């Protein structure tokens, strides 16, 4: 003789087939057999030693500024570099660059900046994108207003409000309890 409320504890059935499937898929994704030869991503200090390590692995004690001996060796070097780094290099780049030092330089130029600053990264949808800061304009009068998405800000605000609610409400509850006690 009451309204039960629709909480999943009261439900008993083998339905929600489209949700169950999704859940299963998620589970599978979480634990699946896969090579994954690039787990952690490469800081510039790391890069500095990484190249050396690669050289040691491959060709032994040879100058980094000097060219590769053979193609197989080069391939070996490059693969190793990729694996240690986390970021795979475009085949064109591989074809072009003919020395470990050169490779390192390329890496520094290209993949390092996006690793440190995440919003400075390359989104394909806008290839002609530009990312200016107030520092770039060498003058006090010029400044760049921060691009914080009007969604993110909103979310933050909401979170703050929630936190406040949790706090003040909790305090009130505590007070009430105290009153009840004495």
């Amino acid at each position: 003789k009451n309204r039960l409320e629709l909480i999943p504890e009261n439900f008993i059935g083998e339905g929600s087939r489209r949700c169950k499937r999704q859940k299963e898929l998620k589970l599978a994704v979480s634990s699946a057999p896969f090579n994954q030869w690039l787990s952690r991503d490469k800081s510039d200090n790391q890069l500095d030693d990484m190249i050396l390590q690669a050289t040691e692995k491959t060709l032994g004690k040879v100058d980094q500024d000097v060219q590769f001996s053979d193609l197989v060796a080069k391939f070996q070097f490059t693969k190793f570099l990729q694996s240690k780094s986390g970021y795979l290099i475009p085949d064109y780049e591989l074809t072009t660059l003919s020395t470990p030092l050169q490779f390192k330089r390329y890496i520094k130029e290209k993949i390092l900046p996006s690793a440190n600053d995440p919003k400075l990264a390359y989104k394909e949808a806008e290839p002609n994108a530009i990312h200016p800061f107030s520092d770039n304009y060498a003058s006090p009068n010029i400044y760049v207003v921060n691009d914080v998405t009007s969604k993110e800000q909103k979310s933050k605000y909401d979170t703050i409000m929630k936190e406040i609610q949790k706090l003040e409400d909790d305090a009130t509850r505590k007070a009430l309890e105290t009153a009840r006690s004495a």
């Binding site: 898929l25 193609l71 197989v72 080069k74 070996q76 795979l88 085949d91 064109y92 780049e93």
Partner: protein, 239 residues
């Protein structure tokens, strides 16, 4: 003499991989003409447009004053009415009538392109893709491998059904969830297609012989068999 008269580089290295993950096995040297051609966008444009034209259905069929339903009766006498002159009620001048210069049944929008030009365009597309670094070649049986092909993963470009899960995992790994991709395959890898069909909207799976320039250009990342690639090269050679 003519100074600065160098000889051009004739080859370019494309790293062969293994398609569930993508672990580099070998370098293969492919000719410069099919993978490092300078970007001639106008040639590309010629191809793409041509392709589009050929793809048209062309079913614009409004009724002309001939095909429109009315009778041929002259609605009003020539004179005596004090009104404007009228013929049959099919004139495009009147709201219910036919359309002037109507387009009729199957409209043919097909155009021609020299085969050589088309081939060049194809090559150019491939080159562009390679330059982008969004060309990925998969293969093994045909060439000597430097690193040995790993276990639990093959070189066939093939895979609830488990395959789908694997595909999903691969996508997750390679940061190419939302973006469109193109699998150029040597034969009908049915399993692969089955795996991919959940992500059908963003996934093209194409048989070798039927790959289009548009399809390559459209695709944000292309995955091709080594054999298929070779075949393509042979097709759009030069001679």
């Amino acid at each position: 003499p003519l100074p600065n008269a160098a000889i051009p580089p004739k080859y370019a290295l494309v790293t062969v991989r293994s398609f569930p993950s993508l672990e580099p096995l070998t370098f293969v040297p492919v000719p410069t003409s099919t993978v490092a051609a300078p970007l001639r966008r106008d040639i590309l444009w010629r191809a793409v447009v041509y392709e589009n034209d050929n793809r048209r259905v062309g079913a614009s069929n409004p009724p002309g004053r001939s095909e429109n339903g009315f009778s041929r009766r002259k609605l009003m006498p020539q004179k005596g009415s004090g009104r404007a002159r009228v013929g049959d009620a099919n004139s495009p001048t009147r709201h219910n009538g036919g359309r002037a210069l109507a387009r009729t049944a199957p409209n043919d929008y097909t155009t021609e392109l020299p085969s050589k030009v088309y081939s060049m365009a194809f090559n150019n597309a491939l080159s562009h893709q390679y330059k982008s670094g969004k060309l990925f070649v998969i293969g093994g049986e045909k060439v000597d491998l430097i690193s040995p092909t790993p276990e639990l993963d093959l070189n066939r470009l093939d895979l609830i059904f488990e395959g789908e899960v694997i595909f999903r995992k691969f996508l997750e790994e390679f940061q190419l969830k939302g973006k469109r991709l193109l699998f150029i395959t040597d034969k009908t890898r049915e399993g692969l297609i089955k795996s991919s069909d959940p992500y059908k909207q963003k996934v093209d799976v194409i048989q070798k012989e039927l790959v289009e320039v548009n399809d390559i250009l459209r695709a944000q990342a292309v995955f091709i068999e080594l054999e298929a690639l070779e075949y393509l090269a042979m097709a759009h050679q030069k001679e």
